[PDB]
Symmetry: C3
Subunit: 71 residues, 3 copies
């Protein structure tokens, strides 16, 4: 959602820099900061998913071991 | 895969802008659109993974509860 | 972690290009390569998570089928 907010902000600066191409340098540098911030937020969300996956792994493993032990 | 297509397209424009650095402005602005589109596709795929993780969570939880209830 | 290294490197070039804005073109082109490399590493990590999710799916499915078959 913040990712969606940084992406919508990036789409804005892209229209600006495009319409300015049709001054320009500052907006390109600003747009690179917008892209970096999106990438950084996506990395935060990706790190969460990695840990969520490991936790699911541990949970499935516990069930698998339980079923094995029940034999 | 579309991500891989936007990334290969970004690698192309990077060589262009590099070899043009060795006109340039338009390709930098074009390359920023290539990066934004990659980021946006990656966000689509990341959103899918988030929902896939939640669904796995619900599935494991149902199994855990079943095993608990079977006692 | 490499993602964190490409992102910290991107944050450096952003300060350079900002402080140079306050020559500039080369650093913008360099910064676009930094962003592309971050995006590409994130795509590698995202592809891993996708496969990790599929494998968890197969594992949960095997447990679900086992419990079904035990009836």
């Amino acid at each position: 959602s913040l990712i969606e907010e940084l992406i919508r902000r990036s789409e804005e600066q892209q229209r600006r820099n495009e319409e300015a191409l049709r001054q320009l340098l500052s907006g390109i540098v600003q747009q690179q900061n917008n892209l970096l911030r999106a990438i950084e937020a996506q990395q935060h969300l990706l790190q969460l998913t990695v840990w969520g996956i490991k936790q699911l792994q541990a949970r499935i493993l516990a069930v698998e071991r339980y079923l094995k032990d029940q034999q």
